[PDB]
Each structure stands twice: as structure tokens, then as C-alpha cells.
């Protein structure tokens, strides 16, 4: 033992070692408060947390317009009970709603013999319909009814007197919300007399029963001033149009479409879709379908899709078919009219396995859409880029920022990304990670470099870069 003992120690340690052990201990507690109040400074100098902006259910994912039930399932199971079996597919797409209908009773073109309370027995009963709601709400897939009255003829709103047409719709809002539907959709309100007046009543009826219930209105318009007139007194109204239906195919023009639609509304919640009922393929060539999709999933708003827009359902590539309502192509036995007219890379079941297929692009975005707190409710800032580019940044406070670069031109271009106006929170690094690319043939994960960034003809990029300063 190297011990100096206990009784012999008390003689050696006393003299002036009482003071310098009383004073050595005081430097501890003055060194503790210099670490106590040195940690109160950093928590006060630390900025804030931005509060979450009270999202409803239609803010957190896409929608899925299902127009014609007899063509969605097919022949034999075109009914409401057959719809109850497809929900395990729609949840794989992670849609948060279904625009369902119209399923009410329309004889043909009669104001007198069209009822909005009673469904058509081509489909089923309310007991089929009550089972459909309760089965879907187990999976948290909400159901929105389509209440366009004359859904079989020329004029959808019955060109004769209009208040009784409105009085049916005034009363059917009250009835079906008792049944448990979570919103409504009327369409073609360019054929409505004084259209912007009846919606604000129907908005107030829908808000007059709850506040998790929405209303969607359709139109065939593409003019900006025609749209904003319908959104004058209304603010919590979703409005699908054909504002993006014009082809353009140039990035500086599509940038002029979107940013003016945001600047006119300010910052309100949009609903990005090309058309009110039609598919994406009706307006686009097949090499742009992987390119509008990503843009639809990244722009601030609720993307609304029609059925078959995830598998690239074109009606023109399959003759002997109604353009208005196509035939869903689940597998090879989905088109019983002509044998052998369907290839293998053209079906749900065939594209459910390829990691490069167009349906595989859809589940990768609809995953990242309703999970990234940037993409849900982030602020939006597009900035200048090359001649055929549409480039923008979605960012919430300190979450994972994003960056989308799009190539609407058929020339292999470079980035040329200069920010020069983005705020202090949205300043860009030089190296930036990749998440995916539209055209295959990239290293999905390799941190790309923005000044050394080139593109292929018609290829879009979803980069992401973390919060830093």
C-alpha cells in the first residue's frame, strides 16, 4: 500500500490546506453555474418551432376519381358490392379518398324523374352502400359522392328551370351526410346559372354539419379570370379545372401557369389536376406521363387523379372502347372483347412487379407524399433555371428539404441552378443527395452536385437535401 495513513494525515493536512480546499470547492460551484447559465443562453438563442397548420384529411394525400363502376371492375361485377373487394389495391396506392359516383337515379333528361335520395338498382342498395362506407372507413379511405344531376345526357344541369334542380341538391346534402359520406363533388358548373352563388350556400351546408367535410367543384374552363371569379367569396372550396390542359410542352410556360395560379390565390390550398374527369393520357404523349406525375405530387395542393392514371391507361391504344369510360386493365383477361390486344407491360398485374414500371413510380411518390412533413404542408418557392426547366423547392421549417428539376424539352441540358433570391432557410448546398429519377439509369442515392448536373431529354429528378446552415 502507498497509504499515507489517517492519524498521521491529520497533522500534515490542516495548516493552509483548509483554505485552499474551501476555495478549490468554490471554483466548482462557480464552474457549475457557468455551465448552468451557459446552457440557458443556447436554449433562448435557439429560434422557435413552427406550429403545425391544422391539416384535415384531404390535405394529406391524393384523391382517385372513379367515374364508371361498370368499367372499373368490368363486366359481371360492375356494382357496389364488387367495389368492396378492390380497396386492398387502393390502399396500396395510398389514396386518402375516392370520388365515387354518381349512383343516384337518373331515368334520362327528366327533371321530374331524377331523384337524388334513391340509388340506381343497377348497383345495389343502401345496405350495399352503408357496408361500403363502413368497410372503407375501417381502412381510413374516405368516400366522396358525385352529385352531378344529369350524368347521362348533354346538359348536366337540366336546361329548364333551375331552382328545383338546386332544391334537390340542397336537400341531398342533408340526407347523405346522415348516411356518413365525407364530402361531395359537383361537376360542370359552367352550365349552372349564377354558379358562384349556389356553391357558397352548399359550402355552408357542408360546413353546417361538420368541418371534416369538403366540396369539390368541376369545370371545363382554362381561363384564369373565369376561375378566380368562382373563388371570390368562397375560400375553402376545392376547384378542379382544365387550367393545365393546354399542352405547351415548354418549361418556362408551365412555370408561368403554376406560379401565376399561386400568386393570384396567394398561398391557399389548390388542387392540382389536369382535367375534371378525363385521364392524363388524353392530353399527353406517353413519354410525358412519368413527368407530370412527379410535378403533380410535389406542387402545393391535393393532387386528384382518375383511375388508370397510375398505369398509363390510354384509350387510343386500345380500339373498340368508349373514350369517356375506358376498361380497367387488371391483367390479360381484363379486355374480353378482343383477344390478344393487350400486352404484358400494359396491365395492373404485369406492372405490379417491375421496379421500373409507371405504377412503381406512383407508389414511390404516394409513399413520400403523405409522410414527408415538407411535402405535406411546406412553403413553396420556384426559381430560375435553364430554358426547358421547371425547378422548385418545397420546404417546411427544419425537416428534409426537397428539390425537383424537370425537363420539358427534348435536348439533353445542364442545370444552371443559381438561387440568388431564395431565403436564408432555403439556401442550397453544392452537393445534394438523390432520391429517385424518372428515366432509369441513375445511382439512386449518390449525392449529386448541382453545378455539375446535367439532364437527359424528358427526365425529371427528385433530389433531397437536409436542413443545414
Amino acid at each position: 500500500t502507498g497509504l499515507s495513513k489517517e492519524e498521521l494525515l491529520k497533522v500534515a493536512g490542516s495548516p493552509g490546506w483548509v483554505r485552499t480546499r474551501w476555495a478549490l470547492l468554490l471554483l466548482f460551484w462557480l464552474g457549475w453555474l457557468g455551465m448552468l447559465a451557459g446552457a440557458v443562453v443556447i436554449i433562448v438563442r435557439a429560434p422557435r418551432c413552427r406550429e403545425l397548420p391544422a391539416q384535415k384529411w384531404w390535405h394529406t394525400g391524393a384523391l382517385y376519381r372513379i367515374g364508371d363502376l361498370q368499367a372499373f371492375q368490368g363486366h359481371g361485377a360492375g356494382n357496389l358490392a364488387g367495389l368492396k373487394g378492390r380497396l386492398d389495391y387502393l390502399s396500396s396506392l395510398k389514396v386518402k379518398g375516392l370520388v365515387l359516383g354518381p349512383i343516384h337515379k337518373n331515368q334520362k333528361d327528366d327533371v321530374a324523374q331524377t331523384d337524388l335520395l334513391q340509388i340506381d338498382p343497377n348497383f345495389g342498395s343502401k345496405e350495399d352502400f352503408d357496408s361500403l362506407l363502413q368497410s372503407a372507413k375501417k381502412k381510413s379511405i374516405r368516400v366522396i359522392l358525385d352529385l352531378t344531376p344529369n350524368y347521362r345526357g348533354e346538359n348536366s344541369w337540366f336546361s329548364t328551370q333551375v331552382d328545383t334542380v338546386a332544391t334537390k341538391v340542397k336537400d341531398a346534402l342533408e340526407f347523405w351526410l346522415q348516411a356518413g359520406v365525407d364530402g361531395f363533388q359537383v361537376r360542370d358548373i359552367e352550365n349552372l346559372k349564377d354558379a358562384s352563388s349556389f356553391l357558397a350556400e352548399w359550402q355552408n351546408i357542408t360546413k353546417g354539419f361538420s368541418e371534416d367535410r369538403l366540396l369539390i367543384a368541376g369545370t371545363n374552363s382554362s381561363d384564369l379570370q373565369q376561375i378566380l371569379s368562382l373563388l371570390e367569396s368562397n375560400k375553402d372550396l376545392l376547384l378542379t379545372s382544365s387550367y393545365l390542359s393546354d399542352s405547351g410542352s415548354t418549361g418556362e410556360h408551365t412555370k408561368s401557369l403554376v406560379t401565376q395560379y399561386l400568386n393570384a390565390t396567394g398561398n391557399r390550398w389548390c388542387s392540382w389536376s389536369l382535367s375534371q374527369a378525363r385521364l392524363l393520357t388524353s392530353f399527353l404523349p406517353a413519354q410525358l406521363l412519368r413527368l407530370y406525375q412527379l410535378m403533380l405530387f410535389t406542387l402545393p395542393g391535393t393532387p386528384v387523379f382518375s383511375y388508370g392514371d397510375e398505369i398509363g391507361l390510354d384509350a387510343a391504344a386500345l380500339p373498340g372502347q368508349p373514350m369517356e369510360a375506358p376498361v380497367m386493365l387488371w391483367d390479360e383477361s381484363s379486355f374480353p372483347d378482343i383477344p390478344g390486344a393487350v400486352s404484358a407491360n400494359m396491365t395492373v398485374k404485369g406492372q405490379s412487379e417491375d421496379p421500373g414500371s409507371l405504377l412503381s413510380l406512383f407508389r414511390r411518390l404516394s409513399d413520400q407524399r403523405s409522410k414527408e412533413r415538407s411535402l405535406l404542408h411546406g412553403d413553396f418557392h420556384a426559381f430560375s433555371a435553364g430554358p426547358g426547366l421547371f425547378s422548385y423547392i418545397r420546404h417546411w421549417d427544419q425537416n428534409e428539404r426537397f428539390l425537383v428539376v424537370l425537363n420539358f424539352g427534348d435536348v439533353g441540358l445542364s442545370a444552371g441552378l443559381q438561387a440568388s433570391d431564395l431565403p436564408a432557410s432555403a439556401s442550397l448546398p453544392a452537393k445534394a443527395d438523390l432520391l429517385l429519377s424518372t428515366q432509369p439509369g441513375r445511382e439512386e442515392g449518390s449525392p449529386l452536385e448541382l453545378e455539375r448536373l446535367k439532364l437527359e431529354p424528358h427526365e425529371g429528378l427528385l433530389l433531397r437535401f437536409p436542413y443545414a446552415a
Binding site: T1, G2, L3, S4, K5, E6, L9, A12, G13, W17, R21, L24, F28, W32, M35, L36, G38, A39, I42, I43, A46, C49, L52, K371, D397, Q398
Partner: protein
């Protein structure tokens, strides 16, 4: 009898690993269905382990567990090797992590949805420690009572989360998430599965270095392993039922995202939410750092009396005894882990060398059954039941070479630096006589510095 014997067995465990790990096992297993299997494999694997230290503790039974048993089998540089590891890898990093979770459960309720700045969650983990040794450097009769209140607040927060989780199924949306999505998937079986187990076994730590004391107080002689099968799955049951309270009320994305899983469960249920969930868990983590400083005194008395650990360590103050130079050396080596980066980089760094040292004592237990029988073992275990432990245990070590050798590499640097000072420590030829004056000069300098006298001799 044993009904008071089970409760102190449960008291050693269920510290603060349960308030970290459900974001760690959920991160490395995908599904919440498979992540609950990990909490079932850890409960079984601790039954096998603690039942061997029930046996191995009662054969030799000198004092100072896991090191005297290392001594009585090896008794050389391997005994000093395990004292070198546990003083510099296991026991400091087992205390910095619990000190870090105390900091994040004060600052996360203040924000409430941002990442807490790392440079301000470290300087609260130091005040959780540097204040808490200064309690323990003062009187133990205060320090044992303060800890006695910190097993109530721990067990009250656990029992709250169960009934707050059980009613959520009963109120509405029974099995509201019910996900088993990566039950067939996200299982690399040599990668992400094992690092789920390094973390899932962190929440069960403590079955080894404290379970010795239960036996001699009730004098059950051989009735202790009857308690160890009754006690430990009941603890495993508690770790199951909190994960069900996390999975049903929260989602699989909120748990991946948050540093704090408990406060998201606290926000969902009520609006008080600042007197309950951070308070009753900020008192849980504040006791396990306190409960890890009583045991640091008991270890240096064992190491110094054999010749290791220079005698400045393990010396008591006269008035109000509290081994000052012991407790200073614990907190200094704990604060040097404030140069770390992230928690789960340290839990993977803790649990490598932890399950190495536990595997060495049981191999030493089983080589003491090949050679040297008739030592009057009072507990009969099966011939392959500790072997069933060891081949399961050595699996976890060797698969952590293919996965992250950046931590196992530098950890072998610090244990091959203990050898150098072994040969200068106890192998050394005492010839030069300047240092034998220099050691005596330094020892009287620190005793005059801290007012400590040797152990009663």
C-alpha cells in the same frame, strides 16, 4: 419470502432503456410486428443469462461480481483487462446515455416539434451528472433516500402508459394501426436484426452486476432460481405492453422521427402534457444515473485490494464517508463521452464490449466445470443451458465486424492500451526508486488535495 424477493429483482431492471429503445428497435426492424418479436427474444435471452449468474454467483461468492469471477478463473492480466474495459467502455457509456435521455426529456416538451440542438442537450447531461456526484460525495444517508423516491416515479409512469394504452383500443378503433407490414421483409438476418438486439438488450441491463445481493438477505439458499423464472417474464410482459401502447396510439412514422417517443404519446391523450410525461420520466433517468454511482464505490474496493487500481482510488473521507477519489474518476470518464455524436452510435458501442465480457465469465464458468470439479456447486444447471447462451452470445460479437467496425476498431485500441500500463503497473521491476518516491509524492498530494484517509486496516 419470495413475494418480497421478486420486487427487488424487478427494481434493478426497468430503468430508462425503455424510454429510448422503441425508436431504436423500430428503426432497424421496419414493422411494428417484428419489433415486438425482438422484445420477446430479449426477455428469453435474459432468463438464460441471469440464471447462470444465479449459479455462477453462488459457487465462488467472494465480493465484487463479474470481476472476482474473472479473477478466480484467470487471475492475471485478463482480470485487469476486464477492469480496464468496464472502467472505460461499459460503465461510463452506460451513464452518459441515461444522462442524455434526461436532457432530451426536458427540452423536447419545450419545443415541442423540432430537433433539440445537440450542443444544448449535452450541457444538460453534464449538469445531470456533475450535480449528481456532488450529492453522492456528500452523505449516503441522503443519497439513498433520494433514490428511494425515484423508483416510484419510474413505476408510476410505466403503469400510466399501460392504462393509457389499454383504453385506446377499448374506446374506439380497436387495433387502430395493427401493422405487421415488414413481418416478411426488412430482415437482413445478419445486419439490421442484430442491431435491433443490441438496443433491445440495453433495456434489460442490470441483471448481472446487482443480482448477487438478493440471496443472502432472505436466506433462501436454493429458492432463488424459483424466483428468477417468475420475475423476469413479468418484466418482459411490461416491455411488451408499452410497445402496444406506442404502436396503437402513435404511427410508424412518428416513432421513427422523434427523439422522444413518450411525449408524442403524451400529446395524443391529454392537454396537461407537461406535468406528466416529461416529469415522471425525467425523474426516471435521474435515478439511474444516481443508482449507478452507489455501485461505483463497491467496485474500486475490490480492485485496489488485489494490487490493481493505484491506491489513491478507494479511499474514504473521515467525516461523512463517501469515497471522493472513486466518484471523481467516474464522473470525469463519463464527461469524456460528451465528445460523441449520436445515442445509437454509443449503444452499439456499449453493447459490443458488454456482451463480450459477459460471454467470457460464462466460458470461465464452463471451463471450471471441465477442470476442477467437486467445488460444491449449490445450483445445478443443465450441461448445455449455458452453452445455449454462449453460442447465441458469440453470434452477436462476430456479426458486429461485418456491421460497423468503426466502433469495434478503436475499442480494441483502448484495451490494448491497458496492457502497456499492466506491465508498468504490476509486472514492473521496482528498481528506479524515483517513481516509488514519485508515486508516494503524488498520493500524498491528492490526499492533501481531497482529505481522504485509507480504508480501515
Amino acid at each position: 419470502t419470495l413475494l418480497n424477493g421478486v420486487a427487488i429483482i424487478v427494481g434493478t431492471i426497468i430503468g430508462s432503456g425503455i424510454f429510448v429503445t422503441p425508436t431504436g428497435v423500430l428503426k432497424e426492424a421496419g414493422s411494428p410486428g417484428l419489433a415486438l418479436v425482438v422484445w420477446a427474444a430479449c426477455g428469453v435471452f435474459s432468463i438464460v443469462g441471469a440464471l447462470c449468474y444465479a449459479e455462477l454467483g453462488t459457487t465462488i461468492s467472494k465480493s465484487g461480481g463479474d470481476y472476482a469471477y474473472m479473477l478466480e478463473v484467470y487471475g492475471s492480466l485478463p482480470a485487469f483487462l476486464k477492469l480496464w474495459i468496464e472502467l472505460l467502455i461499459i460503465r461510463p457509456s452506460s451513464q452518459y446515455i441515461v444522462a442524455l435521455v434526461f436532457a432530451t426529456y426536458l427540452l423536447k416538451p419545450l419545443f415541442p416539434t423540432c430537433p433539440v440542438p445537440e450542443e444544448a442537450a449535452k450541457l444538460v447531461a453534464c449538469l445531470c451528472v456533475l450535480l449528481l456526484t456532488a450529492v453522492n460525495c456528500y452523505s449516503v444517508k441522503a443519497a439513498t433516500r433520494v433514490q428511494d423516491a425515484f423508483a416510484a416515479a419510474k413505476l408510476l409512469a410505466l403503469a400510466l402508459i399501460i392504462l393509457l394504452g389499454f383504453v385506446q383500443i377499448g374506446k374506439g378503433d380497436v387495433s387502430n394501426l395493427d401493422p405487421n407490414f415488414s413481418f416478411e421483409g426488412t430482415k437482413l438476418d445478419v445486419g439490421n436484426i442484430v442491431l435491433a438486439l443490441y438496443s433491445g438488450l440495453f433495456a434489460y441491463g442490470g441483471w448481472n452486476y446487482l443480482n448477487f445481493v438478493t440471496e443472502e438477505m432472505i436466506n433462501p439458499y436454493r429458492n432463488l432460481p424459483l424466483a428468477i423464472i417468475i420475475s423476469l417474464p413479468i418484466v418482459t410482459l411490461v416491455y411488451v405492453l408499452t410497445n402496444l401502447a406506442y404502436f396503437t396510439t402513435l404511427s410508424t412514422e412518428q416513432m421513427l422521427s422523434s427523439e422522444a417517443v413518450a411525449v408524442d404519446f403524451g400529446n395524443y391523450h391529454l392537454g396537461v402534457m407537461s406535468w406528466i410525461i416529461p416529469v415522471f420520466v425525467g425523474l426516471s433517468c435521474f435515478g439511474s444515473v444516481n443508482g449507478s454511482l452507489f455501485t461505483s464505490s463497491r467496485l474500486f474496493f475490490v480492485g485496489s485490494r488485489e494490487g490493481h487500481l493505484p491506491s489513491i482510488l478507494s479511499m474514504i473521507h473521515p467525516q461523512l464517508l463517501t469515497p471522493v477519489p472513486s466518484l471523481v474518476f467516474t464522473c470525469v470518464m463519463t464527461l469524456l463521452y460528451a465528445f460523441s455524436k449520436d445515442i445509437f452510435s454509443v449503444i452499439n458501442f456499449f453493447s459490443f464490449f458488454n456482451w463480450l465480457c459477459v460471454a467470457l465469465a460464462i466460458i470461465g464458468m464452463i471451463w471450471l466445470r471441465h477442470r476442477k470439479p467437486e467445488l460444491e456447486r449449490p445450483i445445478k444447471v443443465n450441461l448445455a443451458l449455458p452453452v445455449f447462451f454462449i453460442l447465441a452470445c458469440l453470434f452477436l460479437i462476430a456479426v458486429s465486424f461485418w456491421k460497423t467496425p468503426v466502433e469495434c476498431g478503436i475499442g480494441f485500441t483502448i484495451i490494448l492500451s491497458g496492457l502497456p500500463v499492466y506491465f508498468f503497473g504490476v509486472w514492473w521491476k521496482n528498481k528506479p526508486k524515483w517513481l516509488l518516491q514519485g508515486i508516494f509524492s503524488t498520493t500524498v498530494l491528492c490526499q492533501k488535495l481531497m482529505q481522504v484517509v485509507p480504508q480501515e486496516t
